[model samples]
Target: MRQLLLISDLDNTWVGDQQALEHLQEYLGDRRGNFYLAYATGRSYHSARELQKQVGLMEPDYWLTAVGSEIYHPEGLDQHWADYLSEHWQRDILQAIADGFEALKPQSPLEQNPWKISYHLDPQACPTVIDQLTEMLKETGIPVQVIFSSGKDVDLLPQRSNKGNATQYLQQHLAMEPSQTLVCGDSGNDIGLFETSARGVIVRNAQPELLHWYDQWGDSRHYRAQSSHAGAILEAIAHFDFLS
Candidate 1:
């Protein structure tokens, strides 16, 4: 039988509820050999690790951080994936364009990555900050993926990068089938994960942007959970009958 690959987002998706997370971890611990866990998040590896320490998060098999621009395996950084993202990724150009927007404040140094441009934006800064940024980049003939999440965070990455792309790459590398993967998330940045053929679960506390996207594009393969955070993940595991 194929091992179930669970690729989940951090923050509100996987770690919000401490009790639920412990329970979820306990459940996964009981069936460790039957599954694989990966975390795909906008957080930098440093911040991700800090959060992991604070929450006592179970170590995942892989870490897809910086909105999936950087990936880490238990052994070390996935150098091949890093080299692939570096291709045609003009960070300077992306930053130059972003500099023109006063509403976009650069995030802390740790939040920035070699392949990612991070920023903070007020939801009321404009009618649609992400759309405006995306249009600007397109107008400049730049190939980048612009993601806005939590009504405050903005991430600009290589055109070929995102949570889904990273997860797909890992799946192929592990020789896992799409049907064997399940992704969970709770924000707009997580939308890419749901775009993949793998089964998806959107937790109950999902932000507005993700909820809107799901309403329009979600299908039978996606589960909208009645519970938030880890509770939803447990619910999805049963709903999808992943073990069977």
Candidate 2:
């Protein structure tokens, strides 16, 4: 049985620093055909391409871009799965989220800015306000999911959009089951994917609250590796008996 690994998140999860890309290239080169490489990130398609090039990741099998809103497969790589959303759906979802934001602006801590048909909230203003704002948005008829990226910024995309959904999409596209996959991440947004994936690897640098949550779950299957990029990936591979 072939193993399908969905590597989501780019910045902190994959490469802690720009130079870490070289380490990633070396790592991937060694593991070439043992598993498939798919980038599931909140970045747009264009941004994904730029990052892939910057990181020296020659065309990957699949690119889950725009936080599961879009999927791209390199030529001769693999067939793309059916999209869960359509052009109209994208427009409608964005409009709904924008409208909700406007109606709840008084409760929001940061001003809303439209970026690539979606909206984002500033992370510097006030953390407490953002929680209230997200709760208010959720109360609206629209489904808006709030996710944080590298910085203090928070991204608001469709509720159906996330790494977990993207992983599931890739699983079906590759004719693989959820049991055969492993997901590794280290943040608040990654928690959703961690819960849904067959095996979840949380890095050592993750927030203490998150570690506490996982500990309460009491599952030995979930492992915590040392801090930093190389240690995280190497530790996960070793734990799963994939290391040579």
Candidate 3:
């Protein structure tokens, strides 16, 4: 049997509910040495570590952080990932982008990273306001990807920096079959992952906007799990029936 590669987003996807988290702990523990777990998140490494401790999430084999601008492995930082970002990223470009918008405020430092340009936005102003940023980037050919996450947050990353890309890179490095790899997440940032050849799960607690996004994207490779957090993951494990 192919070894399973379980790549999951941390916030609402895996760690939200106590019961589901406990269920995950037991299930994952029972299958120890049979799979690899990786976490993809917009969080900084320290913040992600703190969450791991607080929630008892098993330490992931790899950490894809800062909107996938950086990746870490058990041995250390993935130097290639760092180099790749350094080659593709321009910090001044984000400063110029941010200066264009007075409405954008710096997010708390805890949520910021070198490769991640983080900001807070008024939820009401979001829809009406973002096209300027999009238009500017497209018009100027700035090589950056912009993602609006969690309604109130905005992140600017290298154009290639995304959960799916990073997870796919890791899967390639591990030589895992795309079919045996599962990516789980709950927000707009996760849409890219669902688009990939690697299979995916969008838990029931997902943002409705994302739910509608997949509806339009329309790929059967992705599964919809009807439970919250890791409860949904368990449902997916059964639904995918990958173990069999």
- Expressed as tens digits, the lDDT of each residue in 1-244 for candidate 2 is 4564646556566756445556655776876777777776666777777877776554667777666556677653222333334212343454464456532222232222222244444544455655766676677655567665433545565666567777776777677766566677666556656766566678776655456668777265677877555457666776776534
Model 3 stretches astray by more than 4 angstroms: none
Q: Arrange candidates by TM-score, highest first: which order?
A: 1, 3, 2
Better of 1 and 3 by lDDT: 1
Q: All predictions: root-mean-square deviation over Cα?
A: 1.2, 5.0, 1.6
TM-score of each: 0.97, 0.74, 0.94
What lDDT is reached at residue 101 by model 2?
A: 52
Once superposed on the true structure, which residue ranges of model 2 sit more than 4 Å away at CA?
17-24, 75-83, 86-120, 149-151, 207-219
Model 3 TM-score (2 dp): 0.94
Error of 3 at 143 (Å): 1.7
Best model per TM-score:
1
RMSD (CA, Å), candidate 3 to true, equals: 1.6
Q: Which should have the higher TM-score, number 1 or number 3? A: 1
lDDT values for all models: 0.90, 0.59, 0.81
What's the lDDT for residue 79 in model 1? 89
- Report the CA-based lDDT of candidate 1 relative to the real structure: 0.90
Give per-candidate clash totals: 0, 0, 0
TM-score attained by model 2: 0.74
Give the per-residue lDDT digits (tens) of candidate 1, residues 1-244: 4479999998988999999999999999988889888999988888899999999999998999988998989998988998999887889998999878888999888888888998999656984766888899877766788888878888888877899999999899888988889999999889999999999999999999899999899999999999999999999999999886
